[PDB]
Amino acid sequence: ILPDSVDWREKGCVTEVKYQGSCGACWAFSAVGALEAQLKLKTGKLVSLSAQNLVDCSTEKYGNKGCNGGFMTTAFQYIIDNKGIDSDASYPYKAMDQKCQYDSKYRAATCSKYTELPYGREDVLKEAVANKGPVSVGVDARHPSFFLYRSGVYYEPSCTQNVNHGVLVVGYGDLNGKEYWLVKNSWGHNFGEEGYIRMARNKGNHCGIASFPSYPEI
């Protein structure tokens, strides 16, 4: 029943690619990206949400360390606990750790729950991407080839299932006989294909893409 390919950009559910700079905030970008799609699905409005709000506010209580890393799932829980997250416009990204400056007057989204998908199951990830929306994932992005990706479907024999980088699966498909996951990164539009990378799909949980998937709901 699932479509052979999905691209949530086609449905206007994906915001512009962001640039995290020298702050290890990929986790926060991944989390807001997933929530941005849900916000569009629920309200019809596409709005960039504040990764900085997560960096500054979803901190020790959530096991997160701001520019030194965090979890997408615990970011979602912060949004639930906090009863909101501010817009990116209201609480802009500065690529540094700041005091928490959340203000409900700038709230642009809420979250009521999140779901973690079973480990390594690319079929379940496919179903979620098709039926729920973009899914936050971790990948192994440590390998020099990752940084140099320009086009095609990324396959790195040295990749592992030990994830170190938080990104957003916004689709899937097949290109020239290679199944892929369409991944939104947060290293700006210079990276890959305008900020995206197509990563090998159904190749044994390549780079751990299906290791730790999660998605929020509004």
Ligand SMILES: C/C=C/C[C@H](C(C)=O)n1cc([C@@](C)(NC(=O)c2ccccc2)C(C)C)nn1
């Ligand atoms: C040590 C710096 C990590 C930066 C960085 C990034 C890709 O920007 N990063 C990796 C992570 C990952 C691997 N999480 C963690 O590394 C992490 C770190 C501290 C506390 C909690 C978690 C997530 C993707 C799960 N979070 N941020």
